[PDB]
Amino acid sequence: ATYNVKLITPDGEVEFKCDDDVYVLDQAEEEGIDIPYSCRAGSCSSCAGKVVSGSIDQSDQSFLDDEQMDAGYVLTCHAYPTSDVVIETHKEEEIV
Template identity: 50%
Template sequence: MTTTYKVRLTKVVKRKNQETGKKEEFTEMDLTLDVPEDKYILEAFEDAINDDEIQYPDGIDELPSSCRSGSCSSCLGRIVEGTVNQEDQSFLDDEQMEKGWVLLCVAYPTSDCIIKTHQEANLG
């Protein structure tokens, strides 16, 4: 029997608060999916969209992706909580993975997870 995990995907952006003038974090997306342990997180997200199980939030039209083979950083996320298996990837080094960077196109959940999406610009 396949184990299924809860994977919470969030997109948080910093922008200027019009009232205070200070930069603050705003959540643009916060979705939770049931992802089988043998399915990539990006694939499970797209299946849920296609099956009308979830809908894109306003202003979000996709999770970024390009190569779909773990060899670029388009689908980069950052694990806030939980673990994944991304042994199929070839882009991130061990240090980056230890810091929580994850390629959603080739990541299988190995526990319940919280992952920040749309992180490519933040990879240092």
């Protein structure tokens, strides 16, 4: 129910409110968050962030491996915040 998502951006963080039923992008741009997006389809080799804490559901994309997920990564186009989550954005060239 509308959680406090942190995006640790290079800029130096953008904490924002993200609905459990919205993507961590769609509602980010609303606050003004320029995430490193390229598309919204979910068959890419870019567009990721590092899950620091909390849990979220990205069972929608088709890119990040089990390794990357477990290792602490998430796609940044198709992700639903299930609680207060902390993630770092700009992690294309940290997962590949």
